[PDB]
Design a protein around this ligand. Structure first.
Ligand SMILES: O=P(O)(O)O[C@H]1[C@H](OP(=O)(O)O)[C@@H](OP(=O)(O)O)[C@H](OP(=O)(O)O)[C@@H](OP(=O)(O)O)[C@H]1OP(=O)(O)O
Ligand SMILES: [K+]
Ligand SMILES: [K+]
Ligand SMILES: [Zn+2]
Lengths: 368, 157, 69, 69, 47
């Protein structure tokens, strides 16, 4: 069975975005408590990540973007307002105390895991704090400030000829996509809602550019996709991707906001279907790195990222055991969710159309 | 629909495509804080002993912050596989002394009735400051102030 | 009840303690064993010698409780 | 009666055995003593720490009877 | 007292905090007496 390395620092659950803000890092702490009381923590290699410094954050970002982040505080908020507009810090990307330290942890957890897989001393690595995929080279976006995913990926390319990135998140992974848009070495696939939705990106025709053309797959969607639909479109695709791209290391972003009953998300998936993806990628047996990301009904984010960990460990788990946050989990106190009566606007014709378009794009690649 | 500016594109992954075991750190980036151990601990004789060890703790044993399970969770980890070395360094002088090099310990672990009353009124006036209430209690931080706000929010039900 | 701590520390230590007690009685089992056999020799087949040994060693542990009375 | 002959031997050996058991628990009395005090430290004066220690060590002997079931 | 009205009460009191006339109009079914009674029982459950 596969070896798993888990990364966690406790201050992550204590950093606070602000009033009414859907991003709440406390969810990661809940997961950490449930993995434990499930008895799984026992089974895997646990780590604290040390702080990631501006040295290695700047290996992708601007030297002054990071300098701005290192310098900014709510104290000097009105002083820096000129730059704040230049760097997108505002309405939905607030300033809050301990912001930079939160980044150093989320980034340090990923980059540490990037080396561990590069070192060939694990098979899987997980950092649920990571998975922030909207951040840009020179500006924050979509609650993301530093794109650890890139910074992780940039390490793996040292060792790995072809790195596959995948994105389940209901939001499109434009940050990682943009950050590898013209390189063939990094394939960015993204399944996501599209149409009247953030970041507005990742349509059918977002293919790539230059060398990176035909290496940025996308798959827009409408409301209310089921597990059955999603499975029937996920596995065939990824099979062809593995058939064509032939990566030597995977990075799966396990966006949980694509679940049913999300605050911001409007998909209709369960833990089982969301996790069945993680099973399928695990089946291919590459060096692996599972991250988190979006997810805003935190009671189910906990259920999601917990269960998905068990899948990386290929063990069974029932009945939610007792823990600190046991009272969060509704009257049911159950792991699994069921889909809603919400309507699936993804007709079979619309799915089969786009499918065939993609197959054509994937056939363009070299093979024998 | 967005644009792809050449200046703000990305920073050239810069690989060698092999770099095989190239003396990388990450003993620095991360610190090991558990190893799987089923040799003498889970050999179908002792795997149930830890289950009893841990439910044991959330009871009249010493506190560190006050949830007496977590201290015992912390300490079996602290001992790397052992029972009495656990039980001793658990009970022996203090839980802070034997392990200070990780510092996650103090992070994870990290309120009087007087401050409690002022907090309740301090929150019943602003209800969303978290900067002036911090100045109300300079001793305590926004983290603990926010933590107690949740524990109360849970005690509502 | 918070005093359940005692009951559960106990369960933790019971395997280790039971190992040491078994070591103790092993020194004395030969006395019990022949004594039971001498009974089954002087009474008939309906005597369970093994049951007599077990009952005796249980009774021993009962009487030892006076150490902690 | 068979059980009488055995208990009669049991009485002969009880002093020697009680000595060895007392020797055993002397190794473990500190763990009981810390825990019982800790209960009293947290709960208050109405806890009898000595009574808790005695009850626990008696209970250990009750559970040891499973060596001879 | 239902959980539904309980949530609205908690927010209805966390907005005014001393109306007892508009919160009465929030819940026309219940009276100021029961509304005030539940406010005490909660105030005691604080400790
Ligand atoms: O009252 P609850 O059923 O426990 O739900 C509340 C409530 O969320 P809803 O308004 O969607 O029910 C709070 O929202 P506000 O009262 O602030 O409008 C929210 O606070 P945020 O929206 O600021 O997150 C808070 O969440 P938290 O406890 O993380 O502060 C959350 O409580 P639960 O998280 O326990 O559901
Ligand atoms: K996506
Ligand atoms: K690409
Ligand atoms: Zn998202």
């Amino acid at each position: 069975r596969r070896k798993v390395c888990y990364y966690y620092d406790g201050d992550v659950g204590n950093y606070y975005y602000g009033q009414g803000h859907p991003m709440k890092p406390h969810r990661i702490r809940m997961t950490h408590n449930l993995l434990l009381n499930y008895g799984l923590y026992r089974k895997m290699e646990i780590y604290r990540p040390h702080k990631a410094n501006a040295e290695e954050m700047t290996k992708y970002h601007s030297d002054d973007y990071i300098k701005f982040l290192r310098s900014i505080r709510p104290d000097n908020m009105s002083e820096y307002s000129k730059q704040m507009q230049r760097f997108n810090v505002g309405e939905d990307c607030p300033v809050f105390d301990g912001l930079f330290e939160f980044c150093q942890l989320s980034t340090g957890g990923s980059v540490a895991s990037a080396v561990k897989l590069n070192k060939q001393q694990t098979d899987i690595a997980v950092n649920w704090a990571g998975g922030l995929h909207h951040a840009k080279k020179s500006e924050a976006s979509g609650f993301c400030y530093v794109n650890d995913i890139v910074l992780a990926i940039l390490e793996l390319l040292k060792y790995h000829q072809r790195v596959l990135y995948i994105d389940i998140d209901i939001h499109h992974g434009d940050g990682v996509e943009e950050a590898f848009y013209t390189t063939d070495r990094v394939m960015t696939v993204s399944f996501h809602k599209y149409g009247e939705y953030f970041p507005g990106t990742g349509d059918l025709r977002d293919i790539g550019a230059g060398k990176g053309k035909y290496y940025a797959v996308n798959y827009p969607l409408r409301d209310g996709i089921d597990d059955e639909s999603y499975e029937a479109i996920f596995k065939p695709v990824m099979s062809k991707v593995m058939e064509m791209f032939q990566p030597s290391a995977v990075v799966l972003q396990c966006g949980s906001d694509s679940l049913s009953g999300d605050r911001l998300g409007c998909f209709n998936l369960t833990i089982k279907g969301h996790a069945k993806c993680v099973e399928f990628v695990k089946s291919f047996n590459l060096p692996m790195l599972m991250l988190g990301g979006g997810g805003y009904t935190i009671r189910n984010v906990a259920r999601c990222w917990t269960y998905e960990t068990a899948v990386a460990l290929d063990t069974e788990i029932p009945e939610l055991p007792y823990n600190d946050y046991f009272e969060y989990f509704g009257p049911d106190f159950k792991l699994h969710i069921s889909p809603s009566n919400m309507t699936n606007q993804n007709t079979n014709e619309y799915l089969e159309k786009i499918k065939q378009r993609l197959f054509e794009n994937l056939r363009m690649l070299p093979h024998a | 629909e967005p644009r792809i500016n050449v200046g703000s594109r990305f920073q050239a992954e810069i690989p060698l495509m092999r770099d095989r075991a190239l003396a990388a750190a990450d003993p620095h980036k991360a610190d090991l804080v558990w190893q799987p151990w089923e040799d003498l601990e889970s050999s179908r004789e002792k795997q149930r002993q830890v289950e009893d060890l841990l439910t044991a703790a959330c009871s009249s044993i010493f506190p560190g912050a006050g949830t007496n399970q977590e201290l015992a969770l912390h300490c079996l980890h602290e001992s790397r596989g052992d029972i009495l070395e656990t039980l001793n360094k658990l009970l022996l002088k203090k839980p802070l002394r034997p392990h200070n090099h990780p510092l996650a310990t103090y992070h994870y672990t990290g309120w009087k009735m007087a401050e409690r009353k002022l907090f309740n009124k301090g929150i019943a006036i602003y209800k969303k400051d978290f900067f002036l209430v911090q100045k109300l209690i300079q001793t305590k931080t926004v983290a603990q102030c926010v933590e107690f706000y949740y524990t109360y929010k849970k005690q509502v039900k | 009840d918070p005093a359940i701590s005692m009951d559960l520390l106990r369960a933790v230590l019971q395997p280790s303690i039971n190992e040491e007690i078994q070591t103790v009685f092993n020194k004395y089992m030969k006395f019990f064993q022949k004594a039971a056999l001498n009974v089954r020799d002087n009474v008939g087949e309906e005597v369970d010698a093994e049951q007599l040994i077990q009952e005796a060693c249980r009774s021993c542990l009962e009487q030892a409780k006076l150490l902690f009375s």
